[PDB]
Design a protein around this ligand. Sequence first.
Ligand SMILES: [Zn+2]
Ligand SMILES: [Zn+2]
Ligand SMILES: [Zn+2]
Ligand SMILES: [Zn+2]
Ligand SMILES: [Zn+2]
Ligand SMILES: [Zn+2]
Ligand SMILES: [Zn+2]
Ligand SMILES: [Zn+2]
Ligand SMILES: [Zn+2]
Length: 203
Amino acid sequence: AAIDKLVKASHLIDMNDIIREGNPTLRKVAEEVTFPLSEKEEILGEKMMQFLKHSQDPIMAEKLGLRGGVGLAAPQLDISKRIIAVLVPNVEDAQGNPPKEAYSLQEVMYNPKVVSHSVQDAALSDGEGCLSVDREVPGYVVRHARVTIEYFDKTGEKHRLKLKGYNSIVVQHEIDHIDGIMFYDRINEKNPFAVKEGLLILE
Ligand SMILES: [Zn+2]
Ligand SMILES: [Zn+2]
Ligand SMILES: [Zn+2]
Ligand SMILES: [Zn+2]
Ligand SMILES: [Zn+2]
Ligand SMILES: [Zn+2]
Ligand SMILES: [Zn+2]
Ligand SMILES: [Zn+2]
Ligand SMILES: [Zn+2]
């Protein structure tokens, strides 16, 4: 089982742990976790966060052969549980000063879901990618501009959070993975770059 390989104390998640487009696990609805968490589930969360951390450190990323990334969902590791990790850094300013907060979003989320959202839609100008998808896929991935989410942390504490902009896009993309939805499911079928009036194009 994947879970045993991934939770071994010395194991670091890398690209070779990521399942590929076509693997049926990517299209399942992932199973809810129960609290208190098993050790495996707690460790998996930690390994997932560490993966993002490693991904974002140019030298660790070079060492492990990782591209930079801000999100990861358990189904991408062949684990059909509702566990996602998100790590969205703030950027340095023009003078090279680090931001006051390292991250605008940093969480391992258990059983996350969208509980409400804006009528307005948004999409990243540059489109979206996927660690599991080894194809070029152009177009606007159309999502909710703003969302309210609930989730539980590793302790079982419930959180409720409003998200907008890029962080909104990120959590939606991850939650989609745990529902068996892929980014290109949300790209217009006739014209990948169609803009419905009022769509927020995010720079
Ligand atoms: Zn591995
Ligand atoms: Zn069940
Ligand atoms: Zn722990
Ligand atoms: Zn490390
Ligand atoms: Zn609620
Ligand atoms: Zn709705
Ligand atoms: Zn993804
Ligand atoms: Zn929705
Ligand atoms: Zn399509």
